[model samples]
Target: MEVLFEAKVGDITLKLAQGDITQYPAKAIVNAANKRLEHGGGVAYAIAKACAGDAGLYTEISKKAMREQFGRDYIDHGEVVVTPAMNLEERGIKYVFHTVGPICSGMWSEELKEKLYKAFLGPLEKAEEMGVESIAFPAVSAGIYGCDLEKVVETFLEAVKNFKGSAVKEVALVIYDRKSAEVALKVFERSL
Candidate 1:
């Protein structure tokens, strides 16, 4: 919940903070989501739990969004989609940007980096189109997707730096632990 690092990029205030992204109180939270629309573990799980609300209403809504926009069963990697926050209002959030990060096959490659880049910026573009002022992003592909932490952090920052938007005034890189926070902090510092 503490701001660990901050950088000014154009009109956007890029922040590196320590907290559970699912509990992030912002306009929207990014999900390192799956193509299948299942929120099973990590940040996705917490978000699903928080937004499930009274009786899985938010889950139903998200599923509907996926079905309507992407398809009945799959969302391709490198694609990002926006859906209602529904009951996430109780968690002080308004929308969810779902993105599928590349499964890096336990190795770093240009293809993985490119896919990760798209995953990072795809949501930002969608958020801008939605007129959201602030959004929180988990370091995509750094966790279960198995990309290197330093590289992932660097790419996420790069996306923020190159972002072009009018409505997005704040971009939060929400880190949940000290280790990731240290990596993010180091990268953000070097960038400055």
Candidate 2:
């Protein structure tokens, strides 16, 4: 993993890194998931495949967990569904927090920003409640959902900065590709 930026937000260590989110050794990793917990594409697909040899099986497990936890097969925005990491448990990752971000179809607006902001903040809040020490996150809504990379990166940083989580000591914004990493790096630099 290439760490492009690091900073301190209160007692939390915030890092911006370019690498596979699955390889990051955080206690928990946030999945940029859909409301139905479908692992068909993007980060969710990769995460499911890594967590279990079969993505379809992982999807079933995720859906089951969601149903058991919330009495439903779908989750709303700003809500988190916690599941075991399965094979990822060997990598020291105990839990996977799945959260749905808003799907932006048109121009960016205040409503989209608020929903995207909650996409990042929801997992952080859940982690703190679970007493997790460290977590890794992807740029939710920036992939197939088509949110701007710069906006996603900025909103992620802002969420981490404003979070009041005492148990969560570290948060890493892990990007998968170089192009997206460049945009994230620029945002982190400007924030610093």
TM-score of each: 0.92, 0.97
145-168: candidate 2 lDDT, tens digit per residue: 999889998888889888997899
Q: What TM-score would candidate 2 get against the native?
A: 0.97
Residue 184 shift from truth in candidate 1, angstroms? 1.1
Best prediction by TM-score: 2
What's the CA RMSD for each of the models? 1.9, 0.9
Q: Would you list the C-alpha lDDT of every candidate in the order shown?
A: 0.82, 0.92
> Could you give candidate 1's per-residue lDDT for residues 1-192 as a string of tens digits?
888987789989888899888677689899988777677776777777777743245456667888888777667665666776666777778888988888875789888898899899999998888899999999887888888888988888888888898999989989888988998899889987
Which parts of model 1 have CA positions greater than 4 angstroms off? Answer: 53-60
lDDT for 17 in candidate 2 is 94
In terms of lDDT, the best-performing candidate is 2
